[PDB]
Amino acid sequence: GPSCKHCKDDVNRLCRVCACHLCGGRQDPDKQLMCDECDMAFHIYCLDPPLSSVPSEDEWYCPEC
Ligand SMILES: [Zn+2]
Ligand SMILES: [Zn+2]
Ligand SMILES: [Zn+2]
Ligand SMILES: [Zn+2]
C-alpha cells in the first residue's frame, strides 16, 4: 500500500503526479500517454494540440520534454 504518496490513491481527489498530468483526472487510461522520459501521464485530449487518437509510434514524449 499506497502506490502514490501525493493524492494517496484517493480516487475522489485529483492528481497530476499519478493521473493525467494536466487535468489530474483518472478517467480513460486507454486514452492516456506516458512520456517515456518524464513518465507522467497525459489525456490525449488534454494535450495541445489534442490528439484525435493515440499515436501508433508507440514511443511518445510529453510537451514538458
Ligand atoms: Zn496521486
Ligand atoms: Zn486530462
Ligand atoms: Zn515527459
Ligand atoms: Zn508539469
Curated annotation (Swiss-Prot):
The record marks P29, Q32 as: Histone H3R2me0 binding. Expressed in thymus, bone marrow, testis, lung and heart. Overexpressed in breast cancer. Multidomain protein that acts as a key epigenetic regulator by bridging DNA methylation and chromatin modification. Specifically recognizes and binds hemimethylated DNA at replication forks via its YDG domain and recruits DNMT1 methyltransferase to ensure faithful propagation of the DNA methylation patterns through DNA replication. Induction: Up-regulated in proliferating cells, and down-regulated in quiescent cells. Down-regulated upon adriamycin-induced DNA damage, in a p53/TP53 and CDKN1A-dependent way. Induced by E2F1 transcription factor. It is found in: Nucleus. The gene is UHRF1. Changing D39A: Impaired binding to histone H3. The record marks C18 as: Histone H3K4me0 binding. A zinc finger (PHD-type) spans 12-65. The tudor-like regions specifically recognize and bind histone H3 unmethylated at 'Arg-2' (H3R2me0), while the PHD-type zinc finger specifically recognizes and binds histone H3 trimethylated at 'Lys-9' (H3K9me3). The tudor-like regions simultaneously recognizes H3K9me3 through a conserved aromatic cage in the first tudor-like subdomain and unmodified H3K4 (H3K4me0) within a groove between the tandem subdomains. The YDG domain (also named SRA domain) specifically recognizes and binds hemimethylated DNA at replication forks (DNA that is only methylated on the mother strand of replicating DNA). It contains a binding pocket that accommodates the 5-methylcytosine that is flipped out of the duplex DNA. 2 specialized loops reach through the resulting gap in the DNA from both the major and the minor grooves to read the other 3 bases of the CpG duplex. The major groove loop confers both specificity for the CpG dinucleotide and discrimination against methylation of deoxycytidine of the complementary strand. This is E3 ubiquitin-protein ligase UHRF1. The chain holds residues 299 to 363 of 793 of the full protein. Ubiquitinated; which leads to proteasomal degradation. Autoubiquitinated; interaction with USP7 leads to deubiquitination and prevents degradation. Polyubiquitination may be stimulated by DNA damage. It comes from the Eukaryota. Interacts with DNMT3A and DNMT3B. Interacts with DNMT1; the interaction is direct. Interacts with USP7; leading to its deubiquitination. Interacts with histone H3. Interacts with HDAC1, but not with HDAC2. Interacts with BLTP3A. Interacts with PML. Interacts with EHMT2. Binds hemimethylated CpG containing oligonucleotides. Interacts with ZNF263; recruited to the SIX3 promoter along with other proteins involved in chromatin modification and transcriptional corepression where it contributes to transcriptional repression. Interacts with UHRF2. Interacts with FANCD2. It is linked to Defects in UHRF1 may be a cause of cancers. Overexpressed in many different forms of human cancers, including bladder, breast, cervical, colorectal and prostate cancers, as well as pancreatic adenocarcinomas, rhabdomyosarcomas and gliomas. Plays an important role in the correlation of histone modification and gene silencing in cancer progression. Expression is associated with a poor prognosis in patients with various cancers, suggesting that it participates in cancer progression. Residues 35-39, 55-57 are annotated as: Histone H3R2me0 binding.
